[PDB]
Design a protein around this ligand. Structure first.
Ligand SMILES: *[C@@H]1O[C@H](CO)[C@@H](O[C@@H]2O[C@H](CO)[C@@H](O[C@@H]3O[C@H](CO)[C@@H](O)[C@H](O)[C@@H]3O)[C@H](O)[C@H]2NC(C)=O)[C@H](O)[C@H]1NC(C)=O
Ligand SMILES: *[C@@H]1O[C@H](CO)[C@@H](O[C@H]2O[C@H](CO)[C@@H](O[C@H]3O[C@H](CO)[C@@H](O)[C@H](O)[C@@H]3O)[C@H](O)[C@H]2NC(C)=O)[C@H](O)[C@H]1NC(C)=O
Ligand SMILES: *[C@@H]1O[C@H](CO)[C@@H](O[C@H]2O[C@H](CO)[C@@H](O[C@H]3O[C@H](CO)[C@@H](O)[C@H](O)[C@@H]3O)[C@H](O)[C@H]2NC(C)=O)[C@H](O)[C@H]1NC(C)=O
Ligand SMILES: *[C@@H]1O[C@H](CO)[C@@H](O[C@H]2O[C@H](CO)[C@@H](O[C@H]3O[C@H](CO)[C@@H](O)[C@H](O)[C@@H]3O)[C@H](O)[C@H]2NC(C)=O)[C@H](O)[C@H]1NC(C)=O
Ligand SMILES: *[C@H]1O[C@H](CO)[C@@H](O[C@@H]2O[C@H](CO)[C@@H](O[C@@H]3O[C@H](CO)[C@@H](O)[C@H](O)[C@@H]3O)[C@H](O)[C@H]2NC(C)=O)[C@H](O)[C@H]1NC(C)=O
Ligand SMILES: *[C@H]1O[C@H](CO)[C@@H](O[C@@H]2O[C@H](CO)[C@@H](O[C@@H]3O[C@H](CO)[C@@H](O)[C@H](O)[C@@H]3O)[C@H](O)[C@H]2NC(C)=O)[C@H](O)[C@H]1NC(C)=O
Ligand SMILES: *[C@H]1O[C@H](CO)[C@@H](O[C@@H]2O[C@H](CO)[C@@H](O[C@@H]3O[C@H](CO)[C@@H](O)[C@H](O)[C@@H]3O)[C@H](O)[C@H]2NC(C)=O)[C@H](O)[C@H]1NC(C)=O
Lengths: 427, 162, 162, 427, 162, 427
């Protein structure tokens, strides 16, 4: 009778008190609003139809031992424009014997995985023993210009005019001819008998367009011979060496003039070739040089400058056995817009020692999915807005932000007991 | 608060005792303040708690990333920035979080009031309902049997005056 | 809820029946559960609903554009950005929206409790108020006349004595 | 008695359930928090006192048949600095007979609506048959420099010094004299009788200031004669054609040197003139050229580079009858910062066939109000933060964002019924 | 509302009269509507108000700057931007502000209901509690003494048993 | 018997009604959520370990009369790299007698407070009467390059090669020798007796590195003599004056060639020296000049271009007595990235008339604390997000925003009374 029943709310120690706007909650468990997200290491893209890749052989779908030799799936290989044994650099200079492939294509996002094919191993030397530096700079520009154009294509031949005294040249170091891009040309000249040739002048034209492709900017290679000194040069040459590229008006845009700059070679009696990367607007350029040699530019990569975009560059090296290089690596990391992909472990291929390495494969696997964000720190296709460590700089998309696991908000869970007003809670 | 056993208005804090929703009974000539759960009444709250907890998932999932789209090609470090951007988004999240907790809280309580009404709606004999959540029945009219019917719910030994 | 004429705690969902605020009456020896609106009691709720709906306009108007000021001279497309900026602002708006609906909801209900109190405050004869919103008068003491006075409000055949 | 009254909340089918933070609401109607906004097509501005326009005749307030001839209101015309028959380009080269107006002024936002006055129709030819290209580039720079300066002004005369052998020249094609900007100058020279003149050298000075106006950067035109070939050139000229502009030191900043670049003409026995747009810092420049001709720059547009700002450019064409051009259009669209205004229907004027076209009027009507935002997609003076389609790139102010009508949030309306807690709603 | 003295549901607006929480008493055969504060009952509200006001500080302090980190080296003016950024942050603050006021409001009222229950829980003699916050005792049974005990709280001359 | 008690909520006039989400509040008092913040005038930094300063004497810790002579505390002086009587500009040209200090160092934030030491007062003249303009431009570049490099250092000597006809020169105006940077060199030449020297060619090398310091970019001074006219020049010189700096190829990067540009002097019979600021990539440059004089560059400031950063520049003037200049001021204000600090009152030093001015001290006091933000408008170490006036442009960190005191949100205070639903509030 004189009893008393009551719906009671009782909270012990296994509690926790989450406070809220307009009433709180005691709870037995609690969990995070969002989970911290880890970046999947490797390369991926967004849109999947706005990307294109330039390939090796590890990407060459139409290669004999296919699946095996590949570092990518078929789906991916389909989006690649490769050809076994090629390299953008190889096509740039067209050295003898080495494969000359017409790389070109369009895409908002360009993925490069080429280069190994012209590593120190290639042991090419056409008046130059260590090409790496050039490789570096060449790559550096390809990436820069690539990250600002939509379309790009090798321009395998351009309108030019060579003088008559000069005649096509062949070289010992260059197997038995010469490179295709810097094109050698020479004229009989013997200083001894006091017969110095006719200083030559030759023109060349960077096109406004090349087939479908619109060229707003050309990447050409300005090359010249570096002699140790006058007398040495004067051994086979008559006055003072020089090669210069002037523009429509006599403005100079490149070269080397030993008539005002000092000789800086150190290769003894024979010169060394130096190739500078030049970005030239389209037009009619001319070059002037000392009689004996003329290194005429006859090729280039053409970029429209239509739009900005991301660039992924995969490192290209040999399995053990042959000497590789990090020009690519260096270059990617030294230019805004490209993301470098590198292996931690060495290369060991399935097809053979140099094709189909596991790591690389699980690295470039992302190219098959659509990510929410891609960074130099990796990619992520998950959805939370937070991550443990700060994603790295070149990054595109909806990238999560860094935040301590603790600092993220908590949601009440398990048993919930609503708290009332103020001193409602009495022990 | 209501002596040793309070209503659906307050909440008992017993650092080491039982915890949850339960039935607190006490007589006027008694020192023993019985506490016990009626897992049959809970049956509602418990399910509702689920329905409630369910909502969070939705609304949280619903947070369509107040997250920025970047085209950062430059290499300069931006931590001082990324950090501040994060401290903010964190803050934004906090509020919308409390927003969820409170809504839950509100709906849960409003749901405990759903029980009272229902329990109260169980006899003019019971119908003592003093304070909200608390009622005083007379075991001379309401023996354990109906007490159990009234609350717990065993469906055995009632009393219809018709 | 409670039988078929639930209190001010629950809400009847009758896909094809009448809709709104109304008076649900039922006798103990009757199968006919009368439902009918008392447009005279509604007179409050209705007006308050207006006052409430009025607030939204203000607060909405009050949204001083969490909208950005641009000086975009460059021509590059920014949809991926504009889009994400929008998805966010949309989200921001959603929350502050729910914030309004809830407030209304709260204020409306708190306003239905304003009626009860007022109706309850209408006689010790009535003063049965079982569950909140529901009461049981005796038509032997409270004939239709006062029932109508109590609720509907016709002001005829109520309470003189004093 | 044993009745039961209850304030009941009942919801049928004409309902809808808006959920909120801390309670929900059932409602009979619903509406959008904000309305999608359409952009008004045409041109407008912000601040109304920070803008200035450069005019034609369709803007010339002081024109005979006024209101009629205008494409703008008076209020607007007031903010314009025009003069019937003028064109920035016309003032740049000052061709014979054509009106030479001193365009100049300041403003955070510059609105250009000139040009038609030197369209193919004008049939001007001063050694050049189709001027459009030049018009294009000229416009291109005006806009660029304009979008970076606060003030700009034509510089109708600059400190120069011409050699004695040379004497003012007149030309057949140039009515019977010559342009004012590229200024012809010549000297008697007959190769036949082996009398080649004295290669000339002349100076010229881009000023640091021009009246109120401060010149941080000058737009000058570097011109030269394009010969088909040597012998042809050698018909009236002695060695090899050339005209070059050097800077303080002998750096070249422009020109054409046929002593190193090839001849590229195809106009038969008489040359063609080519005019390059050059941006020069103020200073003392010099030019050198083959004896016979000297095209001395003698005018320019001067820009301070004080501040960035928007630029609207209205297309300028003739009503039907005379030939028009899209240099303006092309140019605006090809430079960041300016917004192009174009007509869909042709021109049909009220005053006469070429002045006062309806479309244009309702297009430039916006110049009378203050917008909240202006874009290449149109302008808007309303206030909602959303719009159906993405506004176009060059845009300034508080531009609304694209969002599907559906996706915008909804407000409860009509009959409102507050929902309580959980299973509060029972069938 | 009601007569000269309303419940814990409404609030008296007397532009020039006293202000605060107080005890409004009135008899049926009386014109004098006594208003007076019971600083002993207030003792709760007052302290709770503090507790409440305390929270703001926290939550406000808690606003971890939804403030941007800048690396503005360029010299161009950005007022049109800074301004718009401010108008927004101001707006953001406003909402989270209302969020605080409402929460306080809610908790304060819920705390006024804490008194009622407590006052109501003070006798079956009192136990008249008509409308919420208002009750009608009989001074023939409940003389001032207990009235003062019931409300004000002087702890002298009341009780219904022990 | 028939009484009625009620917990009543009553609100008079001393009220105010704050509305909220889910219930309102009446209150007796109200206060701002945040307080408006004033910027502390002067210079400060963030991180305190990422900054470095280049000093005068007013910063020189190792100065005789220390505390007194200083304009900074010790703590601050420690972070400075100064030396009494020095000036970056002084070290740039190394004039005779004046202190030549090796300024160099690293820091994300560089604070300059030097310069006074080569003010008009210094009355130095080495063929130039008013050096201020040069000071201006020199400072201008230091700041620019400084705000883009992490490390910078004076390069006191660089690999060069001078011809034989020429021999070290000394000058009357230059006390009795010459500047150290532009280095005079001459050769006997007497036109009268028709003995014109041998036009000279000399080389010089900007290094890639200088000790720890990496040089990605060099600031060198290209100087030359400005003659009034030929004949005047022909008084002591033989043909036409000229000095030019070519790059690796014959590209010119600077100088003056009177063989194509006009003579512009006005100093009568003796020339005037002009020094241009040049930014040069590292390499081997050459210069050519008319026989008689050769002004060979022999020093420079070297910057890596590693990273961007803030730059504070404190104005440097004399106490009353000696003539000062505003080159610094002008320069800071004219370059993005640096923040200028100026005094309102004049200089009056404690140690003596020129060292230890009060104003300056309380100005540079900030250098001792860590600010939340620094702007050209002052700094602030407080924490509210709002301020009364818009902070000035070059600013870094978490800068507060401008907002009217009123417009900031208000918090209820004092007596709080919760409002219920709708018409809850009644009379
Ligand atoms: C030495 O050369 C320096 C720089 O060539 C001269 O300093 C400059 O002097 C002029 C006139 O005193 C200043 O320009 C003036 O500015 C004011 C306001 O800004 C304006 O009203 C005038 O119309 C004029 O533009 C200029 O600020 C100043 N520059 C600096 C860095 O101080 C100096 O006058 C020369 N001294 C002698 C003795 O010739
Ligand atoms: C909305 O309003 C709530 C009240 O209805 C806020 O809560 C506050 O009240 C509690 C008491 O229930 C405070 O507890 C303090 O005291 C205990 C016991 O000594 C301490 O353990 C505890 O650390 C506190 O110091 C709460 O702290 C207080 N606020 C909070 C955030 O806990 C509720 O917080 C408020 N909602 C928001 C979002 O501010
Ligand atoms: C705050 O809490 C509310 C509960 O009071 C949330 O609501 C939820 O509860 C209702 C019941 O009134 C659910 O309605 C039924 O139908 C829906 C169909 O959409 C089911 O999803 C649900 O399980 C029920 O069977 C509501 O659905 C449910 N949420 C919603 C969004 O409808 C309310 O949403 C919540 N407020 C916020 C801002 O999250
Ligand atoms: C949540 O909903 C509340 C209502 O329950 C809002 O409040 C309001 O309080 C009263 C009643 O609506 C309004 O009064 C208006 O009418 C009276 C007529 O006597 C005028 O005197 C008064 O000036 C008003 O015009 C309040 O105006 C209204 N408050 C506000 C701010 O609109 C409450 O505001 C709402 N929550 C939020 C965050 O807005
Ligand atoms: C106070 O805190 C909790 C209140 O629930 C008590 O712990 C609880 O203990 C029960 C078992 O007695 C746990 O049940 C678990 O799940 C089911 C029932 O839900 C049961 O079949 C399992 O065997 C299991 O035990 C309940 O989840 C658990 N909760 C927590 C947070 O521990 C705790 O014992 C209480 N303290 C005291 C002194 O009673
Ligand atoms: C369930 O929902 C509502 C309940 O009210 C019904 O819709 C409403 O129907 C009434 C008819 O009584 C409409 O009233 C009309 O109002 C206008 C003025 O607005 C007046 O001019 C007319 O004479 C008439 O009285 C009311 O507008 C309408 N509201 C809506 C939102 O539809 C609905 O029909 C109900 N269903 C059933 C089966 O009762
Ligand atoms: C209408 O209501 C307001 C709010 O209560 C009244 O203002 C209040 O006036 C009282 C005077 O009794 C103040 O209380 C006193 O404060 C002093 C503080 O030094 C204290 O020493 C006394 O013991 C006493 O508590 C109270 O602070 C003040 N409140 C506010 C917010 O101003 C006003 O007087 C009322 N109007 C009428 C006609 O009663």
């Amino acid at each position: 009778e004189k009893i008393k029943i009551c719906l009671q709310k009782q909270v012990n120690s296994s509690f926790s008190l989450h406070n809220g706007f307009g009433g709180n909650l005691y709870a037995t468990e609690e969990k995070r609003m969002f989970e911290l997200v880890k970046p999947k290491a490797g390369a991926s893209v967004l849109n999947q139809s706005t990307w294109i890749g330039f390939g090796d052989s590890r990407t060459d779908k139409s290669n004999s031992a296919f699946p095996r030799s590949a570092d990518v799936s078929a789906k991916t290989a389909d989006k690649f424009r490769f050809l076994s044994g090629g390299s953008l650099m190889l096509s740039m200079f067209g050295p003898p014997g080495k494969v000359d492939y017409l790389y070109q294509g369009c895409g908002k996002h360009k993925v490069f995985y080429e280069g190994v094919n012209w590593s120190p191993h290639a042991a090419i030397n056409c008046y130059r023993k260590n090409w790496t530096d050039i490789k570096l700079n060449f790559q550096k520009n390809i990436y820069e210009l690539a990250s600002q154009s939509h379309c790009m294509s090798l321009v395998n031949a351009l309108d030019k005019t060579i003088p008559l005294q000069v005649t096509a040249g062949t070289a010992g170091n260059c197997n038995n001819s010469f490179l295709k891009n810097p094109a050698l040309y020479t004229q009989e000249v013997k200083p001894s008998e006091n017969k110095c040739g006719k200083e030559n002048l030759a023109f060349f034209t960077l096109p406004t367009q090349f087939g479908t492709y619109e060229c707003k900017l050309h990447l050409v290679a300005s090359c010249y011979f570096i002699y140790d000194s006058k007398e040495v040069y004067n051994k086979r040459g008559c006055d003072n060496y020089f090669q210069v590229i002037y523009d429509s008006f006599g403005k100079v845009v490149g070269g080397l003039d030993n008539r005002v700059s000092p000789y800086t070679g150190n290769s003894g009696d024979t010169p060394t070739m130096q190739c500078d990367m030049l970005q030239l607007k389209p037009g009619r350029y001319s070059v002037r040089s000392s009689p004996r040699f003329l290194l005429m530019p006859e090729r280039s990569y053409c970029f429209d400058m239509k739009e900005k975009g991301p660039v992924t560059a995969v490192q290209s090296i040999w399995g053990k056995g042959r000497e590789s290089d990090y020009a690519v690596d260096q270059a990617c990391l030294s230019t805004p817009g490209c993301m470098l992909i590198q292996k931690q472990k060495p290369y060991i291929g399935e097809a053979d020692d140099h094709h189909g390495d596991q790591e690389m494969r699980e690295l470039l696997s992302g190219l098959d999915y659509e990510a929410r964000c891609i960074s130099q720190s990796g990619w992520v296709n998950e959805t939370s807005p937070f991550t443990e460590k700060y994603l790295l700089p070149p990054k595109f998309g909806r990238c999560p932000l860094a935040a301590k696991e603790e600092s993220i908000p908590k949601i009440p869970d398990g048993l919930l007991i609503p708290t009332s007003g103020t001193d409602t809670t009495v022990t | 608060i209501d002596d040793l056993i309070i209503g659906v208005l307050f909440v008992a804090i017993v650092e080491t005792g039982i915890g949850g929703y339960l039935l607190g009974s006490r007589k006027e000539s008694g020192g023993g303040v019985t506490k016990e759960s009626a897992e049959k009444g809970f049956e509602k709250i418990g399910n509702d708690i689920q329905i409630l907890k369910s909502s969070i998932n939705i609304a949280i999932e619903k947070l369509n990333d107040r997250i920025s789209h970047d085209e950062q090609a430059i290499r300069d470090l931006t931590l001082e920035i990324e950090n501040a951007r994060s401290e903010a988004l964190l803050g934004e999240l906090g509020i919308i979080r409390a927003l969820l907790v409170g809504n839950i809280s509100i709906g849960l309580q409003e749901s405990l009031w759903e029980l009272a009404s229902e329990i109260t709606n169980r006899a003019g004999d019971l119908a003592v309902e003093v304070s909200p959540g608390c009622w005083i029945i007379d075991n001379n009219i309401c023996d354990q049997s109906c007490q159990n019917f009234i609350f717990k719910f065993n469906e055995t030994a009632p009393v219809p005056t018709i």
